[PDB]
Every structure is written in structure tokens, then in C-alpha cells.
Design a protein around this ligand. Structure first.
Ligand SMILES: *[C@@H]1O[C@H](CO)[C@@H](O[C@@H]2O[C@H](CO)[C@@H](O[C@@H]3O[C@H](CO)[C@@H](O)[C@H](O)[C@@H]3O)[C@H](O)[C@H]2NC(C)=O)[C@H](O)[C@H]1NC(C)=O
Ligand SMILES: *[C@@H]1O[C@H](CO)[C@@H](O[C@@H]2O[C@H](CO)[C@@H](O)[C@H](O)[C@H]2NC(C)=O)[C@H](O)[C@H]1NC(C)=O
Ligand SMILES: OC[C@H]1O[C@H](O[C@H]2O[C@H](CO)[C@@H](O)[C@H](O)[C@H]2O)[C@H](O)[C@@H](O)[C@@H]1O
Ligand SMILES: OC[C@H]1O[C@H](O[C@H]2O[C@H](CO)[C@@H](O)[C@H](O)[C@H]2O)[C@H](O)[C@@H](O)[C@@H]1O
Ligand SMILES: *[C@@H]1O[C@H](CO)[C@@H](O)[C@H](O)[C@H]1NC(C)=O
Ligand SMILES: *[C@@H]1O[C@H](CO)[C@@H](O)[C@H](O)[C@H]1NC(C)=O
Ligand SMILES: *[C@@H]1O[C@H](CO)[C@@H](O)[C@H](O)[C@H]1NC(C)=O
Ligand SMILES: *[C@@H]1O[C@H](CO)[C@@H](O)[C@H](O)[C@H]1NC(C)=O
Ligand SMILES: *[C@@H]1O[C@H](CO)[C@@H](O)[C@H](O)[C@H]1NC(C)=O
Ligand SMILES: *[C@@H]1O[C@H](CO)[C@@H](O)[C@H](O)[C@H]1NC(C)=O
Ligand SMILES: *[C@@H]1O[C@H](CO)[C@@H](O)[C@H](O)[C@H]1NC(C)=O
Ligand SMILES: OC[C@H]1O[C@H](O)[C@H](O)[C@@H](O)[C@@H]1O
Ligand code: NA
Lengths: 436, 465
């Protein structure tokens, strides 16, 4: 059944839809175009027009594509609708995938898109090359689609399509690849094999990246759901989080995986050092959870192993993590939760967790869970209609300056200023948990 | 291509002037006419235009400049359903304010609260022709612009001598400073005072040029359609994203398993290699959610066929059954090119439904892609959906082809090797295919994998059992 029980908490305000006002254009369509209107002016040069654009394909609009003079059903000519051919095939393919599995969300990874294609298809960035440049510019491109174009599931060919990848570049791409919303290794027919198991360094780089990714899978799944709900992006440029900090405006070698996870990969070829910007905010190292006070200045780490990537938690956010990674996402969904609290400068933290059956287009039952932490207390509100068969096993609080008095169900790592509280809280209803 | 963008002279073009203008509860309107003799630099100057300004919400301002009798091409409602149905906003209740000069015709979009100008064509000619539409805005010194891809350049757009060309093309190596596969005419303008968005709902080819010759500007050089703009006020970067999602519609939700790691290669020669990759990931304790196959699965690269030697139905079923039994997923590539030189389901049903793009003489359009000589479906055809759906239903059934869990779409620009260069390298489809190698010979048929595959049926390793 399709109750969609517990949904609708994170939708944005539905603006006043005065029905009898209809279109302001006074017509029966948003374009103001009747069914035999707006087809294009006749007596046009459709192959080689008077003003020719800087087309990389060649001297005509037809080079390496379909002739741009072809008249389609309804009288539309390829000259005008060429930029929509990618989008309209993609739309037709989505519907075809729905016909053969009507109850499931259709995942479609398409090359050519147009504005609005986000509503029915996802993207991969096409035929890149096994070079450091394509690895570098990858972040500009995922940010374009996820942050600007409303196509949140996007990634390039990890370790590069064309050419032969080196151990170091593929190890590097494996770790960065783990923070793409679409994560896929692909290669050209005359490229040497570049599966992660072909090099020990690349294999361990993958184990590290995929482990972090899978711990954060529900975290990114929630971000993509919130984007589905309101259009709030599942990847964020630094300036999206720090709009008043001009240092962040041109940055495209770091990004936020969701709202909070700062991804600062090593960008320079045959190097183990990275110079990266930390905004004026509290951050916490991944894994250790060790506080790092950003000062709105570039910082330099050295001796970044080729199997490793620099990742920080942004303060002010609650990160719901699977306690462990697993070899399948079917196995992953049976792992309990580690709710990681990263206090902001005000000592507070906010975060969401979306749970459902993971497949169905219209869910029967969903859990739209909100987490709030302030004054040593974690509050869990929202909806809990989805039987997950798993609960919260640990509540990790970062930036705990000193060990607390009581030693009941609590480990304190003094080095990393990290408290871990062992608990057994099911996700069946709202709850409050005192930590400090 | 040439250098039309760089050597164009619009000095002789007269621009437009507003002959009359009226206001509504949520709108501004004006009739526009040539302010002087036509220049017709790149087609015929339209003598008359319409200006339509709709305050749709407090966040979204619609500014549309079009022809007077709805003949100029506009993006079909089918493809991009328009926002603002049943919505209207009193002008003073809008975050953005629209202002215009009558003569010469220019307009400004400003912030209603601060009076800050976000978009300004003051002192810049409007040129509206059959095959060329030019509009230029002022920008602040050292602006921070994002979008107008798909591109592989710096995320924050270059501001000096920067060409950004929007026209979908098969661009191998995703080259910097060149038009790539997708077309997204949206830019974010980020300032210390706030973020705003400028969306051009136009699907024609265009050169956008951003430069600081005298002052900073951005110009649109569009070879068709109308100036159909949505301005979105933010003022937060996320606000612009959310407001732009009101126009595009919010993105579809993704399957949970899709966020798992995907492995693909162009060159996976048979069901044995696909099996061996899957088992080698598990043996080496690297999680793998989904294994893929490119064009190699097909019969001589023909869509909705299987290689009967290298991907035989029986062993293809055993492969996909074992993938599914391990709780993993299977995805394969599909492209629009339908081989027409021999009988195949896609061609046969294609001609029957009569859904292929056609030449003036009425014969189906000919190109060449990987299968060889090929036709291209017409997605505007009212039977195109049924044709495509039924192809999928007949093929991906776990008997005639693999029961896939998701789709990969490639070469949907569409890609057409035949036009290298246009037209058809001055030869026939058959001769171009032979010389270009469409299709190439598949590698020699193997006895099986080059080593045993732990966890996979005997049938997928008959040379090791
Ligand atoms: C999140 O993603 C889901 C799908 O995963 C989006 O579902 C979309 O829902 C709309 C409306 O329910 C569908 O649009 C059409 O509505 C008309 C009603 O006039 C109906 O007659 C059509 O048959 C159609 O249902 C749309 O097809 C559907 N999209 C898909 C891919 O199935 C949803 O809009 C996204 N956003 C939110 C806020 O949930
Ligand atoms: C999967 O891994 C196995 C090793 O476990 C590879 O098998 C080797 O293949 C080479 C030739 O490519 C042979 O010379 C070796 O004798 C094989 N080793 C063993 C132990 O059998 C196999 O090639 C890999 N296959 C894939 C697709 O990655
Ligand atoms: O290999 C399993 C572990 O993977 C991650 O940790 C590694 O990768 C991190 C990012 O480069 C390093 O900071 C860390 O030192 C590595 O051990 C993951 O964080 C762990 O939870 C996994 O056990
Ligand atoms: O000539 C165009 C390109 O053809 C090949 O790549 C295409 O075909 C592959 C197999 O279907 C796909 O993986 C790829 O995405 C397509 O673009 C060739 O490998 C490229 O080098 C050519 O530029
Ligand atoms: C990769 O290197 C191999 C030899 O190791 C060579 O045969 C092949 O041509 C190279 N491929 C590419 C795409 O450069
Ligand atoms: C429509 O207007 C155009 C000029 O924009 C003109 O060339 C054409 O002949 C007109 N057609 C009709 C039916 O008025
Ligand atoms: C503009 O930049 C291009 C390369 O991006 C360069 O070829 C050209 O010289 C530049 N134009 C001018 C007028 O300097
Ligand atoms: C953008 O500017 C950078 C830095 O000057 C330059 O390397 C690049 O060529 C420019 N890109 C284009 C397409 O002009
Ligand atoms: C994953 O690990 C489980 C438990 O050891 C095992 O049963 C399963 O076969 C493994 N699957 C893969 C694909 O590695
Ligand atoms: C139809 O016209 C096209 C375009 O010139 C041409 O290539 C084709 O050979 C023609 N076919 C027939 C049957 O006249
Ligand atoms: C294209 O045409 C030229 C002759 O003009 C020829 O040398 C070349 O081999 C042709 N290639 C194909 C693929 O048709
Ligand atoms: O033919 C293939 C299809 O068969 C059935 O309709 C199943 O419901 C579906 O999961 C499968 O993909
Ligand atoms: Na490669």
C-alpha cells in the first residue's frame, strides 16, 4: 500500500494557488502557446545559421549530431529542440523503466540533459580522461548539477574513462569518489583494467573511502530526500554555508557532502600535502572527532597517505551514521546507528534522519526524524512510522573539554575531546537522552 | 565554426522603443517597435515585440520579450512545464522590482528593499532577429557567477574574455572552454549583499560572453527563440536553489542501493569477465553494490539485442540471478541509434509505429553510430513512448535480455559519427561505417574466464569445472 504515513514535515510553503486566476498570460498553457503555435519562423538556415556559435563539434550545428533541419511531429525542427533531445529520450526511458517496475523509483544515469531534467533523470559527467585535471575539475561539475541545476545524483568516471590511470591518481580518485552522489569507476575499451583490486594502494584507498561513504549513506540519502522535498542542495559550495566570507567565493577544490561534511582532497599530482581553506567556524576531524578551530584562513596538512583523504564535520550539526560499513547496502541497513553530535560555537547541533523501504516511489511508511542537541541533552522529534528493525546504539558528542563525573555507559577519549555514550534507543517514537 | 562572437558589429542595429505600456495587479506590459532602420546582421530584425512582466511570487519575477503573433519557437510545455499557475504577487509585495526606459528600450531588475540593481540592459542594444537574439547586462566589478553549463571550467565563472557556449554535443575528454553534453542556462549571482538567480528558458544554441571591456558585463548571443527570463531573489544561496527548484520542479528521489559503489568498463567482452570482476571485489573485501556492462553486451552493438556467443540468454540469466542472489544490482547502457541495415526488434517495431525522425522527402533520417547505419526516434511522436516502453518490456525480461535494476543512457545528444565532418563525410552511410569501423569485430570467443570465479555457477566457468 501507499499511505506515505509520516511524510510532509520538510516540504516548503505551498504558495497561494488561486485556481480561477489561472495563468496571468490569460491562456490555457504556461508558454502562452496554443498546440499549433510557437513552432518557429520559416525560411531559416538550420544547418549553418547567419550567426554561428563557438561549436566545438565543427563548423555547422549538425557536426557529430543529427541534421538540424529535420521536422519532427508537431512541426518542431531539430535546430530549436536539439538541446532537448537528450532530455526527451531520458524522460521516455524513465517512463519505460517505470512501466517494467511501476512501484520502484527509476534510477537513470544519462549523458545529455537540459534545465528541468532533474525531475525525472540523474547524470554522469561523460567521457573524462585518467588525468589530474579531470580529477580537479570534477568538483566544479558535481557542484554545478547538485547545487545549481537541481540534478543531485551526479559523478564523473572515477579514475578516468580515456587513457591509462596510475596507482596514485586512482587511489586519490577512489577517496574523492566516495563523496560523489553518483560513485562509479568506468574506463575506455583500450584502457588497462582499473578496478580498485588491481593495485593494493587503490584497493585500501577504496576500503577507506567506501567505509566512510557507507557510514554516511543514510546521511546523504536524507540530504537527497530534503532536496527532493524543497530543492535544498545535497552538495554545497563553501559559500552556500559561508555567504559573507569572500575567501570561499572562488573555491572549487573543496565542497560540502550534504550540509556539514567538508571534503578537502589532495589536488596536486605526485604529492602527499594539501593546502585547504577552513572557514571561521568550529570543525571536527573525521573518525578521531578532534576539534579543529577554523580561522577563515588556508591551512596546510603534510604526509596525507594515498589511501587517505582529509574530511571534517562542520559544527552545529547532528550526523546520523550507521555504526559500521558493510559489503552490501542490504547488509548496511541492518547495522545500528551512531548519532554523532558536533556542537557549533553556541554549543547547539541540529540534524535529520530519513528512513523508508529504500526502493518504492510512494512509500507506505517513512520516519522523518529531527535531532536537536543543547545543554548536554539530545532530543529526537518527528515521525517514526517506518519499522527499521534497528535503533541507536551509540551517541557520540564531540568537543567535550573534560571527562564527566558519572561513568555509566560512557567512554571518554581525552586526546580527541570525544564522549561516546552506549544506549539502546529504538526509532519507534520521539525520545530525549541526557549525555552531560 | 568562425569568430562571429568576437568580430560581430551591432553598431548599425537601431534597438527597440516602447510605443505603449500598461500595468496590472501583478504585471507590467509594453508593445516594442524597431527604433530605426533594420540592421539584419544575423537574420531579419523583427519589426514588433511584446514585453510581458509577471510578478508570480515575492521570490520569482517573470520577464519575457517575444514576437507579437506566437510564431518564434518556445520550449514546449510538454518538456518544461512553466511555474506560476494560480500564483500572482502585488508588485510592492515582491523582493524584486522591474523598471524600464521607453526610448531607447532597456530594463532593470532591482531589490525592492535596498534598490540594488541585479540586472541592467541600460545603454545596451536589444537585437531580436529570426536567427539571432542579443541582450547584455551590466554587472558589478569582479562579480561571482555560477552555472551556465554543462561546463568543465572553474565553478566561479571567469569574468574576463570568457566564452560560455550552450549547445549539447558529444565532447570527448569534457574539454575546458567548450560546449559539453548538457544545457543549463541558469546563473547564480553571489554578492556580499545577497545571492540572486537569472534563468533563461531557451533551448537554442547560444554564446554567452563575460568580459570587462570598459565596464563588467555578461551578454547572451542566442540563434533562436525568445528572451524568456525568471529572476529569483534569494537572498541566501540555498534560497536561490529552492526558488530555482520551483521552476525546474524538485528532483526525483533516488533508490538507497544506488548510493552504493558502481563498477563499469567499456570492453567487458563476455558474461565470464563481468562475473570475474564481481567475485574479485568480494575476494579482495572491497564493497560493490552494482556491476554494469557497456555496448559489449549487444549483438554487434545493436540496441535491444544480446551477443548470442558472448552474452547468450542462458548464461546472461545465470549472471544476473547470481548478482541478485548476492543482493547486488545490474545496469547496462542504451542509446537512441537503431540499426536499419538488418532486421531487429527496435527497427521492425520502430518502422511499424513510424516514430523515426524523417527527411523532407519523408524517408527516415540516416546517420551512423556504433551498430553502423542507424535511425533516431522522434520523441515528439505521440507513439514514441509506447514504442520505447514496449522495446524495454520485450528485452529486459531476463529471457531476451538482462533483468536490469536501473538504466544507463549514453550518446543521447544525439551522437552521430556520420557527420565527421557534416555532411556524412561526403560518402554513404554503408561506406562511412566500413571505414570508421561501425561495428568493429568483437574479441575472439573465449572458452570461459581466465581463472575460476568463486561463488558463481559452473556454467560461468565451464573451462574450470
Ligand atoms: C520527489 O520525487 C518524487 C518521485 O520519486 C516526485 O514524484 C512526482 O510527483 C508528481 C506529483 O505527485 C508527479 O507529477 C504528475 O502529477 C499529475 C497531477 O496533475 C499526474 O496526473 C501525473 O501522472 C504525475 O503524477 C510526478 O510524475 C512524480 N515524479 C516521478 C518521477 O514519479 C516528487 O514530485 C518529488 N518531490 C516531492 C516534493 O516529493
Ligand atoms: C580476478 O582475479 C584473479 C586472481 O584471483 C585473476 O586471475 C589471474 O589472471 C591472470 C591473467 O589475467 C593469470 O595469469 C593468473 O594465473 C590468474 N591468477 C589466478 C590465481 O588464478 C583474474 O584475471 C581476475 N579477473 C578480473 C576480471 O579481474
Ligand atoms: O579502512 C576502514 C576504515 O576506513 C576509514 O578510515 C580510514 O580512512 C580515513 C580517511 O582517509 C583515515 O582518516 C583513517 O585514518 C583511515 O583508517 C573509516 O573512517 C574507518 O571508520 C574504517 O574503519
Ligand atoms: O566517437 C565518439 C566516442 O566513441 C567512443 O565512446 C562512446 O562509446 C563508448 C561505448 O559505447 C561509451 O562508453 C562512451 O560514453 C561513448 O562516448 C570512444 O571510446 C570515444 O573515444 C569517442 O570519442
Ligand atoms: C595503456 O597501456 C597499454 C600497455 O600497458 C597499451 O597497450 C595501451 O595502448 C594504453 N592505452 C591507452 C588508452 O593509452
Ligand atoms: C507574424 O509576425 C512575423 C514578424 O514577427 C511576420 O513575419 C509574420 O508574417 C506574421 N504572421 C502572421 C500570421 O501575422
Ligand atoms: C580570449 O581567451 C582565449 C582562450 O580562452 C584566447 O585564445 C584569446 O586570445 C583571448 N582573446 C583575446 C581578445 O585576448
Ligand atoms: C579562465 O581563466 C583561467 C585563468 O586565467 C584560464 O586558465 C582559462 O583559460 C580561462 N578559461 C577560458 C575558457 O577562457
Ligand atoms: C557479504 O558478506 C556476507 C557475510 O560474510 C556474505 O554472506 C555475502 O556473500 C557477502 N557478499 C558480497 C557481495 O561480498
Ligand atoms: C531523401 O533526402 C535525403 C536528404 O538529401 C537524401 O539523403 C536521401 O537520399 C533522399 N532519399 C530519397 C529516397 O529520395
Ligand atoms: C572520410 O573522407 C575522407 C576523404 O575525403 C577519407 O580519407 C576518410 O577515410 C573518410 N573516413 C570515413 C570514416 O568515412
Ligand atoms: O520482465 C521483467 C520484470 O518482470 C516483472 O514484471 C517484475 O515485476 C519486474 O521486477 C521485472 O523487472
Ligand atoms: Na582510464
Amino acid at each position: 500500500s501507499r499511505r506515505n504515513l509520516g511524510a510532509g514535515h520538510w516540504k516548503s510553503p505551498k504558495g497561494k494557488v488561486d485556481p480561477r486566476a489561472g495563468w496571468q498570460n490569460g491562456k490555457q498553457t504556461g508558454s502562452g502557446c496554443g498546440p499549433n503555435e510557437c513552432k518557429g519562423l520559416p525560411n531559416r538556415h538550420l544547418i549553418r545559421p547567419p550567426y554561428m556559435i563557438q561549436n566545438g563539434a565543427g563548423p555547422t550545428l549538425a557536426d557529430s549530431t543529427a541534421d538540424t533541419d529535420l521536422v519532427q511531429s508537431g512541426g518542431y525542427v531539430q535546430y530549436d529542440t536539439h538541446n532537448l533531445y537528450g532530455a526527451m529520450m531520458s524522460s521516455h526511458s524513465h517512463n519505460a523503466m517505470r512501466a517494467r517496475r511501476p512501484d520502484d523509483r527509476a534510477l537513470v544515469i544519462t549523458r545529455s540533459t537540459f534545465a528541468g531534467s532533474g525531475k525525472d533523470v540523474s547524470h554522469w559527467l561523460g567521457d573524462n580522461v585518467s588525468g589530474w585535471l579531470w580529477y580537479q575539475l570534477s568538483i566544479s561539475q558535481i557542484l554545478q548539477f547538485a547545487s545549481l541545476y537541481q540534478i543531485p545524483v551526479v559523478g564523473p568516471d572515477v579514475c578516468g574513462f580515456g587513457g591509462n590511470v596510475t596507482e596514485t591518481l586512482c587511489a586519490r580518485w577512489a577517496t574523492l569518489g566516495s563523496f560523489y552522489t553518483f560513485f562509479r569507476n568506468h574506463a575506455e575499451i583500450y584502457a588497462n583494467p582499473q578496478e580498485f583490486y588491481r593495485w593494493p594502494t587503490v584497493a585500501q584507498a577504496a576500503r577507506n573511502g567506501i567505509s566512510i561513504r557507507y557510514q554516511l549513506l543514510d546521511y546523504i540519502y536524507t540530504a537527497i530526500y530534503k532536496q527532493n522535498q524543497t530543492g535544498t542542495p545535497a552538495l554545497n559550495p563553501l559559500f552556500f554555508n559561508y555567504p559573507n566570507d569572500p575567501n570561499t567565493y572562488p573555491i572549487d577544490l573543496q565542497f560540502f557532502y550534504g550540509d556539514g561534511i567538508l571534503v578537502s582532497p589532495v589536488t596536486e599530482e605526485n604529492s602527499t600535502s594539501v593546502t585547504f581553506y577552513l572557514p571561521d567556524d568550529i570543525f571536527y576531524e573525521w573518525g578521531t572527532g578532534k576539534p579543529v578551530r577554523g580561522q577563515g584562513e588556508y591551512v596546510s596538512l603534510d604526509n596525507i597517505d594515498y589511501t587517505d583523504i582529509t574530511i571534517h564535520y562542520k559544527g552545529g550539526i547532528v550526523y546520523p551514521q550507521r555504526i559500521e560499513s558493510a559489503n552490501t547496502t542490504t547488509a548496511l541497513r541492518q547495522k545500528g546507528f551512531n548519532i554523532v553530535v558536533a556542537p557549533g560555537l553556541d554549543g547547539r547541533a541540529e540534524g535529520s534522519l530519513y528512513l523508508d523501504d529504500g526502493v518504492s516511489v510512494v512509500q507506505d511508511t517513512v520516519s522523518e526524524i529531527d535531532f536537536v542537541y543543547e545543554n548536554g541533552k539530545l532530543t529526537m522529534t518527528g515521525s517514526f512510522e517506518y519499522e527499521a528493525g534497528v535503533g541507536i546504539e551509540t551517541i557520540t558528542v564531540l568537543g567535550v573539554e573534560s571527562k564527566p563525573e558519572g561513568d555509566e555507559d560512557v567512554e571518554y577519549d581525552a586526546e580527541n575531546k570525544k564522549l561516546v555514550k552506549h544506549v539502546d534507543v529504538p526509532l519507534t517514537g520521539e525520545n530525549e537522552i541526557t549525555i552531560l | 565554426p568562425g569568430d562571429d562572437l568576437y568580430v560581430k558589429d551591432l553598431s548599425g542595429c537601431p534597438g527597440y522603443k516602447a510605443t505603449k505600456h500598461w500595468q496590472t495587479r501583478s504585471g507590467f506590459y509594453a508593445d516594442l517597435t524597431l527604433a530605426g532602420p533594420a540592421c539584419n546582421v544575423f537574420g531579419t530584425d523583427l519589426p514588433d515585440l511584446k514585453l510581458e512582466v509577471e510578478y508570480q511570487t515575492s521570490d520569482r519575477l517573470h520577464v519575457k520579450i517575444l514576437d507579437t503573433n506566437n510564431t518564434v519557437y518556445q520550449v514546449p510545455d510538454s518538456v518544461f512545464p512553466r511555474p506560476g499557475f494560480g500564483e500572482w504577487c502585488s508588485p510592492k509585495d515582491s523582493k524584486l522590482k522591474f523598471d524600464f526606459q521607453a526610448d531607447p528600450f532597456s530594463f532593470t531588475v532591482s531589490r525592492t528593499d535596498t534598490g540594488e540593481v541585479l540586472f541592467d540592459t541600460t545603454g545596451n542594444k536589444l537585437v531580436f532577429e529570426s536567427q539571432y537574439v542579443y541582450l547584455k547586462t551590466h554587472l558589478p566589478q569582479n562579480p561571482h557567477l555560477y552555472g551556465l553549463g554543462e561546463h568543465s571550467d572553474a565553478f566561479m565563472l571567469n569574468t574576463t574574455n570568457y566564452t560560455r557556449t550552450i549547445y549539447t554535443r558529444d565532447a570527448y575528454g569534457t574539454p575546458q572552454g567548450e560546449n559539453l553534453y548538457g544545457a543549463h542556462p541558469i546563473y547564480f549571482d553571489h554578492r556580499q549583499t545577497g545571492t540572486h538567480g537569472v534563468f533563461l528558458l531557451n533551448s537554442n544554441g547560444m554564446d554567452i560572453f563575460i568580459d570587462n571591456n570598459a565596464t563588467q558585463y555578461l551578454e547572451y548571443n542566442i540563434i533562436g527563440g525568445v528572451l524568456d527570463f525568471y529572476f529569483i531573489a534569494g537572498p541566501s544561496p540555498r534560497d536561490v536553489a529552492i526558488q530555482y527548484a520551483e521552476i525546474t520542479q524538485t528532483p526525483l528521489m533516488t533508490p538507497y542501493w544506488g548510493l552504493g559503489y558502481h563498477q563499469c568498463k567499456y570492453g567487458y567482452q563476455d558474461v565470464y569477465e563481468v562475473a570475474a570482476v564481481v567475485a574479485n571485489y568480494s575476494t579482495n573485501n572491497i564493497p560493490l553494490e552494482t556491476i554494469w556492462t557497456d555496448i559489449d553486451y549487444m549483438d554487434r552493438r545493436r540496441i535491444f539485442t544480446i551477443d548470442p556467443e558472448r552474452f547468450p540468454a542462458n548464461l546472461y540469466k545465470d549472471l544476473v540471478d547470481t548478482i541478485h542472489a548476492r543482493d547486488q544490482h545490474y545496469i547496462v547502457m542504451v542509446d537512441p541509434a537503431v540499426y536499419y541495415k538488418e532486421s531487429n526488434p527496435a527497427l521492425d517495431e520502430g518502422l511499424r509505429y513510424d516514430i523515426f525522425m524523417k527527411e523532407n522527402n519523408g524517408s527516415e533520417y540516416q546517420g551512423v553510430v556504433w551498430a553502423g547505419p542507424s535511425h533516431f526516434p522522434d520523441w515528439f511522436h505521440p507513439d514514441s513512448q509506447q514504442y520505447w516502453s514496449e522495446q524495454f518490456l520485450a528485452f529486459f525480461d531476463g529471457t531476451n535480455g538482462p533483468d536490469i535494476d536501473a538504466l544507463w543512457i549514453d550518446m543521447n545528444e544525439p551522437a552521430n559519427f556520420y557527420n565527421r565532418p557534416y555532411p556524412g563525410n561526403n560518402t554513404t552511410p554503408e561506406n562511412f561505417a566500413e571505414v570508421d569501423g561501425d561495428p568493429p569485430a568483437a574479441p575472439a570467443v573465449r572458452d570461459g574466464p581466465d581463472a575460476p570465479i568463486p561463488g558463481f555457477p559452473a556454467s560461468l566457468q565451464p573451462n574450470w569445472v
